[PDB]
Design a protein around this ligand. Structure first.
Ligand code: HEM
Ligand code: HEM
Ligand code: HEM
Ligand code: HEM
Length: 107
């Protein structure tokens, strides 16, 4: 089995880098994030060539990196999509977990 890496991982393909902590996500199954591709959970970096390697933040294809982290209605819950469900009607949690600035993802 692949092992979860250390906390403090920087996602840094963009000018708005974000820190990802596996430990705060330990209740989520690994494969919900490292989702199947060709029938096998894929543990490569999300923006690997052929994966979410389209760095145009308006792209909505399966290659759009922004889309994969921010949008609702995706085949796997995105970072923002899952956080919206988690926050519910709690506006303070919405700001913390889904805000575009001054949130836990973006300062
Ligand atoms: C579940 C226990 C689980 C495992 C196992 C796992 C592994 C894993 C690895 C090996 C990496 C490093 C990939 C690399 O080669 O750099 C990695 C990175 C990320 N993970 Fe993960 N991961 C597990 C669980 C989860 C869960 C539940 C999520 C989503 C909430 C998640 C997400 C990520 C993200 C994002 C990264 C960074 C990838 C990037 O492109 O740098 N993981 N994980
Ligand atoms: C890295 C942890 C990672 C994330 C995050 C991620 C997200 C993601 C989402 C949210 C979707 C659905 C988008 C939609 O519009 O429905 C999605 C879809 C696909 N991904 Fe992905 N993905 C991550 C990692 C990887 C890796 C490493 C690859 C390439 C091997 C990859 C590829 C794809 C493909 C292809 C799709 C479409 C799959 C389908 O069943 O339709 N992703 N990803
Ligand atoms: C997608 C790569 C992704 C990111 C980025 C992300 C970030 C994140 C942060 C910054 C926190 C706050 C705690 C910390 O600093 O680690 C946080 C918290 C929760 N998340 Fe998350 N998260 C991403 C993805 C996902 C996905 C796909 C889910 C659900 C399927 C999810 C869930 C949660 C939950 C639950 C928490 C705790 C909420 C709380 O109130 O603290 N995240 N995430
Ligand atoms: C609020 C809906 C929101 C906005 C707007 C937003 C914007 C944003 C930008 C402009 C980028 C860079 C895109 C580029 O290629 O230039 C970016 C990148 C990431 N974001 Fe974001 N973002 C918003 C909210 C959130 C939230 C609440 C999270 C965490 C749950 C989050 C996550 C991410 C991640 C991950 C990236 C990629 C980081 C990297 O690889 O550099 N965003 N976002």
């Amino acid at each position: 089995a692949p092992k979860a890496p250390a906390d403090g991982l920087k996602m840094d393909k963009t000018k708005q880098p974000v820190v990802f902590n596996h430990s705060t996500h330990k209740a989520v199954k690994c494969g919900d994030c490292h989702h199947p591709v060709n029938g096998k959970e894929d543990y490569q970096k999300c923006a690997t060539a052929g994966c979410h390697d389209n760095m145009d933040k308006k792209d909505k294809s399966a290659k759009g990196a922004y889309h994969a982290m921010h949008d609702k209605g995706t085949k796997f819950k995105s970072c923002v999509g899952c956080h919206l469900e988690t926050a519910g009607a709690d506006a303070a949690k919405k700001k913390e977990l889904t805000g575009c600035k001054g949130s836990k993802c973006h300062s």
